[PDB]
Design a protein around this motif. Structure first.
Motif: not given
Length: 281
Positions: A59-84
């Motif tokens: 229900x929306x196109x996304x500009x957000x970005x997240x990174x996965x660290x396998x040593x901790x099995x966790x995603x974390x949101x980082x800086x979003x794109x300039x545009x969805x």
């Protein structure tokens, strides 16, 4: 050493789930899910993290970005794109993540932006010659290739290469067929374009690009038509993950051996997944 299958669309719901394939055991297993559902998501590996770039949550196109660290099995949101950006192609070159084309909901995109993880910043660089969503993107010999896609009003056979030292795209030899939702990967110095959609049929065909001769050639097709397919290279094989055959979304997975020009089906995903992002870590 694992293939990660990130997000996608099972036909019913858009997915936040993520699963990893171990080729020595021929098994997929689910790991930590993304913060948001993402289909049409671009995925790449940089400095030991998996980045999930843009996409569509239903229900929306996304500009957000997240990174996965396998040593901790966790995603974390980082800086979003300039545009969805959904249907965005993503590749890593000289320590940057490039986000190529896509769709922002309002228009299909020719723009391109690059992420520097040391500054957590995206910056826009030179745009493609044509708008491209559902575009396949791979890095070979220091260039980023943008393969096929959809410009809004035609599906594309054209291909263009980005040289970061000149900040310029240039068109090269086109594919044999128009291809959007195409999976792209690099193996033994060739670019493979796997499946996709030519506008009027979903494709099982596969072709390989030789940069020394600037020519595409068709090789052995997939067992199944696959658009929105995720493609990655592991232990000398190309894996085609999930996708959409026209009349069902796919959990199946097949691997291509170039020395025998043969695809073979392996263990399927836990969930059907089209518009899935795939990377090897």
């Amino acid at each position: 050493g694992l293939i990660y299958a990130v997000g996608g669309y099972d036909g019913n719901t858009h997915l936040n789930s993520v699963e990893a394939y171990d080729p020595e055991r021929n098994e997929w297993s689910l790991v930590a899910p993304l913060s948001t559902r993402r289909s049409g998501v671009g995925v790449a590996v940089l400095n030991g993290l998996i980045y999930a770039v843009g996409g569509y949550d239903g229900n929306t196109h996304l500009n957000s970005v997240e990174a996965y660290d396998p040593h901790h099995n966790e995603w974390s949101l980082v800086a979003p794109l300039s545009t969805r950006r959904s249907g965005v192609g993503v590749a890593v070159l000289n320590g940057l993540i490039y986000a190529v084309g896509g769709y922002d909901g309002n228009t299909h995109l020719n723009s391109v932006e690059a992420y520097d993880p040391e500054r957590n910043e995206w910056s826009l660089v030179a745009p493609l010659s044509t708008r491209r969503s559902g575009v396949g993107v791979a890095v070979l010999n220091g260039l980023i290739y943008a393969v096929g896609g959809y410009d809004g009003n035609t599906h594309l056979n054209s291909v263009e290469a980005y040289d970061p030292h000149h900040n310029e795209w240039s068109l090269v030899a086109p594919l044999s067929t128009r291809r959007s939702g195409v999976g792209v990967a690099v193996l033994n110095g060739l670019i493979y374009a796997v499946g996709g959609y030519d506008g009027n049929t979903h494709l099982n065909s596969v072709e390989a690009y030789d940069p020394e001769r600037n020519e595409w050639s068709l090789v052995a097709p997939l067992s199944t038509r696959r658009s929105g397919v995720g493609v990655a290279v592991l232990n000398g094989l190309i894996y085609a993950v999930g996708g959409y055959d026209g009349n069902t979304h796919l959990n199946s997975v097949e691997a291509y051996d170039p020395h025998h020009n043969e695809w073979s089906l392996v263990a399927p995903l836990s969930t059907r997944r089209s518009g899935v992002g795939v990377a090897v870590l």
